Structures are given as C-alpha cells and as structure tokens.
From a paper:
Since the R motif does not contribute to the EM density in the central cavity of hMRP5, we generated a further truncation mutant hMRP5-Δ1-94 by removing the flexible region from Met1-Thr94. This deletion did not have an significantly impact on the ATPase activity and overall inward-open conformation of hMRP5, suggesting hMRP5-Δ1-94 retains dynamic conformational changes to enable substrate transport despite lacking the N-terminus. However, the peptide-derived density was lost in the corresponding position of hMRP5-Δ1-94. This indicates the central cavity density arose from the Met1-Thr94 flexible region, revealing an auto-blocking mechanism where hMRP5 is inhibited by its own N-terminal fragment. Collectively, removal of the autoinhibitory peptide does not disrupt the ATPase activity or conformational cycling of hMRP5; thereby, the empty conformatin of hMRP5-Δ1-94 likely represents a critical apo state primed for substrate recruitment. We found that the helix backbones remained unchanged during the transition from the peptide-autoinhibited state to the apo form. However, the side chain orientations of several residues differed, including Tyr244 (TM2), Glu289 (TM3), Phe452 (TM6), Phe988 (TM9), Lys1040 (TM10), and Arg1148 (TM12). In the apo form, the Phe452 side chain reoriented toward Phe988 (Phe452-Phe988 distance ~8.4 Å). In the apo form, Lys1040 rearranged towards the cytosolic side. Meanwhile, Arg1148 moved from the cytosolic side to the pocket center, likely due to the loss of the electrostatic interaction from phosphorylated Ser60.
Human multidrug resistance protein 5 (hMRP5) effluxes anticancer and antivirus drugs, driving multidrug resistance. To uncover the mechanism of hMRP5, we determine six distinct cryo-EM structures, revealing an autoinhibitory N-terminal peptide that must dissociate to permit subsequent substrate recruitment. Human MRP5 was demonstrated to play a critical function in regulating cellular cyclic GMP (cGMP) homeostasis, which is essential for many physiological processes, including the maintenance of vascular smooth muscle tone and cardiac contractility. hMRP5 also influences signaling transduction pathways and may contribute to drug resistance in anticancer and antivirus therapy. From a clinical oncology perspective, hMRP5 can directly contribute to cancer drug resistance through the efflux of many anticancer drugs, such as methotrexate, cisplatin, purine analogs, pyrimidine analogs, doxorubicin, and antifolates from cells.
Numbering used by the authors: 97 to 501, 574 to 786, 838 to 1169, 1179 to 1436
C-alpha cells in the first residue's frame, strides 16, 4: 500500500520502527534528496477532508441558522472518534506510572527490614518493577502517534477550505494583513498545535489527587501538609511569569525606538562628515542604550527566578512534613519516609506539561473565532440570461444599479450594440463610466431592469497585474504554444525591440527582478495577452494612458482595426483622438444618456461634445573560536570559575539536605536502656533518643541556606551575561563603523541595518535562557550518578556500555533530524509566493474564468509541503523511545543490586539509593534537545566578530583674509579600478571673486566639490589655500571652515534648536539675527514653543521653501569665508528662487562664492565662468568676453538655451 504507515502492524506502530531504513540510508549516503523522501499516504489528501468539512458545515447551517452557528461544535464532531482513544491510552499510562512507587518500592524496603532468606519474593518484585516501566513507556508512544496523525488531517482540511472561500469575494476591502496570513498561511499551524500538544490536559490533576489521598492514608493528619505546600506554591510562579511578560513588552517598545533612530542616521554619512557632526549621534544612541539595558536587567531577574521549580518544592514539603510529624511524639521508619519521598518525586511530572496545553487552547480559540468571522460574507452571482435576438450581444433596458458602499451612480441606462461593431465611450472625471464597467461584469448589485449577456470577456485594467513566471507562459496565460500566432502577436504590438534588451532571451521572469520595466511595456504585454487569448468581446479601459502618439498609432492600426475587425470592442478613454474611426460614440455625463449616434451625427448635433472637442483642440559547524571569543568578552576565566562554583554549591546543598534526612534515622536510640514495662530492655525507637532538637534545628538551617544560595546564583548569572552581551557588540562595533571610507559604497545598506536589529535580539534574549537550562540539567545528572554509585561501589560497571550506546545513537539521530528539517525549510517558499501573487489582483483572475487552475496549484503545493513535516515529527519520537529504554535498564540494575546484598547494609542507605535512582527518568531527551537548541544560537556572534575583524604641522590660524584658491594638476580616481576623472586640472581663483560652473553631466562637475573637502585622496599634484598645502592640515581643522549647501535639504528628528546648533556654541541673539535676515523670524515666533517646537522626520511639518530657508540660515550661522553652492533650484518655484538670490547677494557678498548649477542666469552675473568637458578645463574668461566669442562652447550653449524660447 505504497506508504509504509498503512502496512505496519501494532508492534511496529507502537515503537516507530518503520522509519529505521531512512536512518540507515542517511548514514550510508550523507544527505537526502526530495526524490526518495516519501509520498503522501492518502487519507490525508485535501479533497476528501474538504468535502467532509463542507458537508458538516452545510448541515449545521441548515439545522440551526446563521445567527447561532458555532465552529467549535463542528470541529469537535470532526475530531470526535480519535480523541476518545487518545484519552483512554493517556489514562492507562498515568495509572500504570504510579503503581510502581506506591506498591513495588514499599514491599522491597519492608523485605529489606525483615530477618529471613528468600529469593523468590525479591525476584518477583524485580520483575514487577521492570514490567510496569515497560508498560508506561509504550503507552505514551501510542498516544503521541494517534495525536500527530489527527492534527495533520485537520490542518490540511481547514486551510484548503479557507483559501477556497476567498476567490468568490465581491466586497474586497480588508488589506493584505488578514487575508494573506491569518486565513491561508501559518495561521493553520495553531490549529495543528491545538490537537498535537493541546489535549493532554487531564494528566496532572488525576495523579496529584491520587498521591494526596495515598499520603494521607500512609501517615494521616501530620501527612496533610504536602497539599498545602503545593497549593500555596504554584500561583506564585504564575504571577512571576505575568510580571516578566509585562517588562518584556516595555523593553520591546524602547528597542524599537532605538533601531528607528539607527536607521534614520545610517545613510547621510556625507552630510555628517562634511561638518564633523559625529558627536551628537553617539550621545543619543548611548542614552537610549542605557535605558534599554536597565529594563532588560529587571526583566532578567524576574525571568530567572523560575527555572528551579521541582527539587526545591520536594525538599520544602519533605522538611515541613517530617519536622512537624516528629516534634509531637510519634514513630517513623525507613519504609514510610522513603515511600513518601518517592511519591513526592512523581507528582511533578504532568505539572511540567499542563501550562503549554492551556496556552495552546487559548490561541486555538482565538483563531477559530477569526475563521468563523470570515466564513460569512457575500458570494458571487454571475448573469446567465441570453439575449432575445441572436444578433444582440449586450442588452440594456431601464436598468438601475447601486454600488454597495448602497450608492447609486447609474440611473436608467439604455444601450444596444451588435457583433463586429466598435463602440467608444467618452466622459469627464467622475462621470460614471467606471460604474458601467463594474456593472457589465456583474459585480454591481442589481436593483431594476433586465440584463442579457452572451460571449467571453477579455479585460485589460489600467494597471498591469504582472505574474511571477517566465515571459512565454505569462503571455500564454495557460494556452498551447504556437509559432505564427506568437510572431504575429509580437509584430502587431511591436515587441521585437524589447526582446533584444532582455539579457538572455524571452525566458526570464517579471517578478522582483533587478531592472524592472516601464509602464508602456507593461501595457504592451497586457494587450498582447488580451489579443492572444482570442475571446469574443473585449473590454478596454484606457490601455494607452501613458504612451507616445506614434506607438499608439501603430498599435491601433496593427491590432484594433485589423485583428478585431469582426470582434466586438468596447473602448473607454478620455482622449478624443481615436474616436474618429469608431462607428459609434456614446457620451456619458451626470449618470444619464446625452448623445447617441455616429461621429458625423455628433458633429451635426453640435452639443456639449463639440464644445469639449473645441476646448481640447484649443553551515552550522561553529568552531571553538566562537566560544573562546564569548568567554573572553565576558571578562575572562574568573567569571567562568565563579559561576561554575555557585552552580555546584547550590546542587550540593540540596544533596546534603537529603543525606542528613537519611543519617538521622539510622541512629536508632543510642545504646539507651529504658525500664518500660516490667523488665529493662534496650529500645529501638527513634523517639527515645534524648537528643532530638539538634536534628530539627539542623533541618531548618539547611532549608534557609539552600534558599539563600539559589537567590545569589540567579542574580550573579543574570548580571554577568548582560554585561558580556552589552559590551562586545555595541562598544566595539559602533566605534569602528564610524571611521571607514568608501566601504559604504560597495556594500548594501540593508545588510548593515540588519545585524543591528536581529542579532541584538538573538544575543540579548535567548542565549542566557538556553545556556542556564542546559548547564543545570548536566550538573544534576552528574550528581545523581555520583550519589547512587557512592553507596554501592560495584555500580560503576553497567555505566560503560550504556555510555558507548548513547555515543553511538546520538550521531545518527542528529544527522537524520538535520536532513529532514532542511527539506521542509527549502520547500516552504513557493507556497507563500503563489499565495501572494494570487491575492494581489483578484479582478483579472475572476475576469475570464480562472479559479480551478489556481485551486489545483494550491492543493498540489500544499501536499508537497505537508509530507516532510510528518516525517520529522516521527523521527523525534523514535529517538525519545530509545533513550527511555536505556533509563529503564539502569533502574532495573540498581534494584537488583539492592536485592542481592541483604543483611550487610542498613535500610536507610538502601532507601536513599532507591530514592535517587527513580529521579533519572526523562532527563536525557531534555539534555540532548537543549544542547542542540543552544548550539543553534551561537551563529550571530560569529557574524558580528567577523564584521568587527574585517603628523604635527599646526600653523597659526591665518586661513581667512587672503583666501586664494590655486590648483596645480590635481588628479583623482573614485576607485583604483576606474579611469581618472580629472586630467591635469590647474586654475587660480582671486579672493572675493564669484565663479560659476557650467558643463554637461558626467564631465567632472562634482569631482571638484568632492576633492575640495579631501574626502577622497588625490593621485597627483597639490592644492594650496592661502599659500598653505591642504595635505599638511588636519582633516578636522580644514573642514571646520568651508561650507556647502546640498542640492536636497534634509532635517533630523528633534527640536529646531538641535537642528540649528547641536554644539551650543552660539547664543540666542545671533540665532534671531540670522533668522530675521532670511525673513523667517515671524514663522518661528508664531510657534507656541518657538525654537523648542518639535520637528518630525524629513521635516514634514514645513513646506519645501521653509526647509531651504532653514538651510541657508544654518549656512549663515557658521560665517564661512569660502562657500560652495550646488544646485539649489531643482524643483523650486521662481519666487523662492529670486528670494534666495536676493538673500545670497545681500548676505554672501563678502566672501568667495562658487556656483555649480544647470541655470545659466544664475552664473551670468559672476565675474568669470568656467567650462569643463571630459575632465579638462576648456574656457576661463569673463561672461562678456565669452559671449563675444562665437567659437566658445558657453556661447553656443547660451544660444541653444535662448533658442528654446525665441523660436517657440
């Protein structure tokens, strides 16, 4: 039966032994492939379960009605038959995992206390213990198998129904926030988890109740205190979890703000370095980091108070019960005490899994509510009426429709067209053509009139849908491939030029791409698809919205007039050009019919259409270096030693408390003789000993000591790990990524913004948690083995082969698990891609007929994703069962060891060995899983560490005054692999002289500005300012003088005062004087807080002119002797332009002025004009002389610019 699951018997299904061959193949080969994973096993396909659920829901709706219908009843009825069997198996395992400690151990200890010699009794008891262990383990395996299969079935069915519903929506208004995910995406994983890890809820209370009753039976009124301890304990941990969640949410808000600021200042680095403004941003980031650190610290304390639930509770309950029981006058023995302790050690198993069940159930309930909210919407309704006459295609007779908002836009619409007729519709903006287009497709609701439609539609929207596939099939849209049709379509739409542009051929994709395409080409492929589809009636809505006249004419005369001569065409557009050739024109205005007839008749009528026409014509290897780096960053070996010492001290304290309990009992009476009864005798009772308060005092002291040590350990570990994480990344990374050069160009800025947002989370939140859990588990295992082997020295024989077996099995398990995970991870993505591409643009999908193709593709991709999930879960259960077998063997060995030696060991030590052997169950799986999880988190540190690893000449400040600018053959190159931009450039500028820069783009205009600031080192020559070489002056000293106004005005978040002067080097009087000169003082004065008013990002509070005026203000604040102006007139109005020229000439008239712009009039008034071409200086003369020379290129450019106005 194909899949092996359907052929296995009961024994193979109970042990998961049908998966064994895959492990052997994975070991032999090295990696797996999708060719031999498996297929799907039937009984889990989408169609069968979808039909079943649909039938159930329809029956429910018919039975009750759409007011009180519930999805919970339907889901329960769907999953009713198997949950009962799962519950029965769980009850059997919980009942059989308690009969061991309560009945088997007590009889064994009581036998040890007796004075006989038998082997049959002890052998029978050993047999009983082993059999109970086996039964418990195998029952648990069966429960898990059943639950996994049921969950997979339910998830598939619900997801397929959810995506089936969406394709028939006629009120699409919710954004792609619910539809894309919460209905057909990972939202079904919650419904899977509710049946996989949900349920299992009646597992804790039952065993807890049974244990409480048994304890009261054994001891009684003094045995009635363990219940009190447990009840008073657990709600405290609930409260601690709530507080941790609250603090975590607040920290999330703060770090979101920090990363927002980091993104804001990551790409302005030229602006920052041009003024040497690196001080402020460091301060701001440091403050935000401090606040985040404090909140994280508090959350860490409250989260770490929790991880020690079980042994602490056991010790507390035992101490209280036994102390109160003894300090009243009573009797105790080894059997009772150690039976009670062993029972206390088995109550705390299902209380390790109840909370996950509760939270999973809550999430599932919310998801079901959302699904039921979706399932009630308006369906589709397609018109099936046929025209009375065969010559009629569309029919309209006094039909009125209202758009559902119900808003009327159409009123008494009547028209009639026939096959082979071209009809054009004209109207203004908002006339109501779109309402008619929406009504003819049947989307609009019907209120009055009759509708008749025959034919097939071909719809071209004003926007291209663009489908994630190859060009050939995208044009094909699921049609048979041909040759003459294909080339006729290409020639008709003149797509051949575009084919040569494509790198490879017409086989690439039109998805995200790297070059995208133009709107006109998208329109061209849209009409290509439409006219290749070969439908009956064509609906064309303004396909030529943004095209040139020529291509419109060729497209028209090639396709519309020839191909669709006999095909009905409906044309809706605003332009009145092609309407000459149309055989019918209908004018729509104010939702009523105005004109009807041919074009010539329309001109004959001479109505509003004539007026409008006239107006228009007018891998994960992770070597040890990572661990070494983390340890070195944490502080050194001393921190490691301190933390390990504290862990060992805590666990040793717990072990000492239990040992003292064992040591008190052995000292029976103390060779004390009493005269009770009628004759003297030596008592054997523990109460008779005169010294009893000693031992109770030492008990209380032990409890207090253990509590104090646990608190100290938690605090110290949290603080140390937080310091280790906070130093490395931020301190040694932000200080380095603020002084590279050119590194910012040949590297995307979207992958340096990352590693500041995700890696910080991975290093701050999860690593300490996982490390703490792992270390605690390992140390506990070591202590348990040592404590057992201390009493019986021969126990260190059955530990060797078990270690060898564990080492053999672990590697195979790890390889199989990794390989199975990778396949699911790789195969996830096309599912999501198809879902997104289908959700975007439902109109065209519903336009022709296509629903079945998309549904089939969805189902196929669903199954291909589903299979490896099931395989992965089965592998995990396989490993768990093997480890359980090892533990059972160890327990049986120690029990037999106790039995075989009798009469030479006191009963108390035998009880202690038994009490410590039971604790070993269910630890190895936890240890292995936690080791893998904490290994997977040590990858971020590697990337961060990799990215981290990869004079004098101070003269007097006489720079001002005679500020001469001289160039002597300056050469520079942007990169070492590119041609030199500047080639022997030399010029001298006199002080207080105005110079303009003109030339074509790419000829080296920006090179002068880049090299004047020494941002890129020159390759030859030298530049001297005021007789001082710029190479001998420090970068900080040189940049503090010159100023440049950028072509685009940018502003940062904060107050106006910070945006004007962050260094607080100026008082208010100069700021007001500067603001008054640019006539913006009144605007700031009108602000309620003036200079304290808050400024949003990008300066959205102000208009463009205000931003530019603020830029000139901050330029005027510095009072520089040398100024560079760079294209201040990009898209700014003429009034503001004359304003800025007036302000510049009134303010910058006492300093050297250099201008680089595309407007000749800006540099017309300059003393001299510079012309550059191909990196060489061409012309250097006054404007009067340059204009007088015809051969000058500047004069030719001026004539060409002037001809654009005089001629036109």
């Amino acid at each position: 039966h194909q899949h092996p699951v359907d052929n296995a018997g009961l024994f193979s299904c109970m042990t998961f032994s049908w998966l064994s061959s895959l492990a052997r193949v994975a070991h032999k080969k090295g990696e797996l492939s999708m060719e031999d994973v498996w297929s799907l096993s039937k009984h889990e396909s989408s169609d069968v379960n979808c039909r079943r659920l649909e039938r159930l829901w329809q029956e429910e709706l018919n039975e009750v009605g759409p007011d009180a219908a519930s999805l919970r009843r339907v889901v329960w009825i769907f999953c009713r038959t198997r949950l009962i069997l799962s519950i029965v198996c769980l009850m059997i395992t919980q009942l059989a995992g308690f009969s061991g400690p309560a009945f088997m151990v007590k009889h064994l200890l009581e036998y040890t206390q007796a004075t006989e010699s038998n082997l049959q009794y002890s052998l029978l008891l050993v047999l009983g213990l082993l059999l109970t262990e086996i039964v418990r383990s195998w029952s648990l395996a069966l429960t898990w198998a059943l639950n996994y299969r049921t969950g997979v079935r339910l998830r598939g069915a619900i997801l397929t129904m959810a995506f089936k519903k969406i394709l028939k929506l006629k009120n699409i208004k919710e954004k792609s926030l619910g539809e894309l995910i919460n209905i057909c995406s990972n939202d079904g994983q919650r419904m899977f988890e509710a049946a996989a890890v949900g349920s299992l809820l009646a597992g804790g209370p039952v065993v807890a109740i049974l244990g409480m009753i048994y304890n009261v039976i054994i001891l009684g009124p003094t045995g009635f205190l363990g219940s009190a301890v447990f009840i008073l304990f657990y709600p405290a941990m609930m409260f601690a979890s709530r507080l941790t969640a609250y603090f975590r949410r607040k920290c999330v808000a703060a770090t979101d703000e920090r990363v927002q600021k980091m993104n804001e200042v990551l790409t302005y680095i030229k602006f920052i370095k041009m003024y040497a403004w690196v001080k402020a941003f460091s301060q701001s980031v440091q403050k935000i980091r401090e606040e985040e650190r404090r909140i994280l610290e508090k959350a860490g304390y409250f989260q770490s108070i929790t991880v020690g639930v079980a042994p602490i509770v056991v010790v507390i309950a035992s101490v209280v019960t036994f102390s109160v029981h003894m300090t009243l006058g009573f009797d105790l023995t080894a059997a009772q005490a150690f039976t009670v302790v062993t029972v206390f050690n088995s109550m705390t198993f299902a209380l390790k899994v109840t909370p996950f069940s509760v939270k999973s159930l809550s999430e599932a309930s919310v998801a079901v509510d959302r699904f039921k909210s979706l399932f009630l919407m308006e369906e589709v309704h397609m018109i099936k009426n046929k025209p009375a006459s065969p010559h009629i295609k569309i029919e309209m007779k006094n039909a009125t429709l209202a758009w559902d908002s119900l808003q009327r836009t159409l009123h008494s619409i009547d028209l009639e067209i026939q096959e082979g007729k071209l009809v054009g519709i004209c109207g203004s903006v908002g006339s109501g053509k779109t309402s008619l287009i929406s009504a003819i497709l049947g989307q609009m609701t019907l209120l009055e009139g009759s509708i008749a439609i025959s034919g097939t539609f071909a719809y071209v929207a004003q926007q291209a849908w663009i489908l994630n596939a190859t060009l050939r099939d995208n044009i094909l849209f699921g049609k048979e491939y041909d040759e003459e049709r294909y080339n006729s379509v290409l020639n008709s739409c003149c797509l051949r030029p575009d084919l040569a542009i494509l790198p490879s051929s017409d086989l690439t994709e039109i998805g995200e791409r790297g070059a995208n395409l133009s709107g006109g080409q998208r329109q061209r492929i849209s009409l290509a698809r439409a006219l290749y589809s070969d439908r009956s009636i064509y609906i064309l809505d303004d396909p030529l919205s943004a095209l040139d006249a020529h291509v419109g004419n060729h497209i028209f005369n090639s396709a519309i007039r020839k191909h669709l001569k006999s095909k009905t065409v409906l044309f809706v557009t605003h332009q009145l050009q092609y309407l000459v050739d149309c055989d019918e024109v209908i004018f729509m205005k104010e939702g009523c019919i105005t004109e009807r007839g041919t074009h010539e008749e329309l001109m004959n009528l001479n109505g509003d259409y004539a007026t409008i026409f006239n107006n228009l014509l007018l891998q994960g290897s992770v070597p040890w270096s990572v661990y070494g780096v983390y340890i070195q960053a944490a502080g050194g070996p001393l921190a490691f030693l301190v933390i390990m010492a504290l862990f060992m001290l805590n666990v040793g304290s717990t072990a000492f408390s239990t040992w003292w309990l064992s040591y008190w009992i052995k000292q029976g009476s103390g060779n004390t003789t009493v005269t009770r009864g009628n004759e003297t005798s030596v008592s054997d009772s523990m109460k008779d000993n005169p010294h009893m308060q000693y031992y109770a005092s030492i008990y209380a002291l032990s409890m207090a000591v253990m509590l104090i040590l646990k608190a100290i350990r938690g605090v110290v570990f949290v603080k140390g790990t937080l310091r280790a994480s906070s130093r490395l990344h931020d301190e040694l990374f932000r200080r380095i990524l603020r002084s590279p050069m050119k590194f910012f160009d040949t590297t995307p800025t979207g992958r340096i913004l990352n590693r500041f947002s995700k890696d910080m989370d991975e290093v701050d939140v999860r690593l300490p948690f996982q490390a703490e859990m792992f270390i605690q588990n390992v140390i506990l295992v070591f202590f348990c083995v040592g404590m057992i082997a201390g009493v019986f020295p021969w126990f260190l024989v059955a530990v060797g082969p078990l270690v060898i077996l564990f080492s053999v099995l672990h590697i195979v398990s790890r390889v199989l698990i990794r390989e199975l995970k990778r396949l699911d991870n790789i195969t996830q993505s096309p599912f999501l891609s198809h879902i997104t591409s289908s959700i975007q643009g439902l109109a065209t999908i519903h336009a022709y007929n296509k629903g079945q193709e998309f549904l089939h593709r969805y189902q196929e991709l669903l199954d291909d994703n589903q299979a490896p999930f099931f395989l992965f879960t089965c592998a995990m259960r396989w490993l768990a069962v093997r480890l359980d077998l090892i533990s059972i063997a160890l327990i049986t060995t120690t029990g037999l060891m106790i039995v075989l030696m009798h009469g030479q060991i006191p009963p108390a030590y035998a009880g202690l060995a038994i009490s410590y052997a039971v604790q070993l169950t269910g630890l190895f799986q936890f240890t292995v899983r936690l080791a893998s999880e904490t290994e997977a988190r040590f990858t971020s540190v590697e990337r961060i560490n990799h990215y981290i690893k990869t004079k004098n000449k101070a003269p007097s400040p006489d720079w001002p005054q005679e500020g001469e600018v001289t160039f002597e053959n300056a050469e520079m190159r942007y990169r070492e692999n590119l041609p030199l931009v500047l080639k022997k450039v030399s010029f001298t500028i006199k002080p207080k002289e105005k110079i303009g820069i003109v030339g074509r783009t790419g000829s080296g205009k920006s090179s002068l500005g880049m090299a004047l600031f020494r941002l890129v080192e020159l390759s030859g020559g030298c530049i001297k300012i005021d007789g001082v070489r710029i190479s001998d002056i420090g970068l900080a000293d040189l940049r503090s003088k010159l100023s440049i106004i950028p072509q685009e005005p940018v502003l940062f978040s904060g107050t106006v005062r910070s945006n004007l002067d962050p260094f607080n080097q100026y008082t208010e009087d100069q700021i007001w004087d500067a603001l008054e000169r640019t006539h913006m003082k009144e605007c700031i004065a009108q602000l309620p807080l003036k200079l304290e008013s808050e400024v949003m990002e990008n300066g959205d509070n102000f208009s463009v002119g205000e931003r530019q005026l603020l830029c000139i203000a901050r330029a005027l604040l510095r009072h520089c002797k040398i100024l560079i102006l760079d294209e201040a007139t990009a898209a700014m109005d003429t009034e503001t332009d004359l304003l800025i020229q007036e302000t510049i000439r009134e303010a910058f008239a006492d300093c050297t002025m250099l201008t680089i712009a595309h407007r000749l009039h800006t540099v017309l008034g300059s003393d001299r004009i510079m012309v550059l071409a191909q990196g060489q200086v061409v012309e250097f003369d006054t404007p009067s002389v340059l204009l007088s020379n015809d051969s000058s290129r500047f004069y030719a450019m001026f004539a060409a610019a002037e001809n654009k106005v005089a001629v036109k």
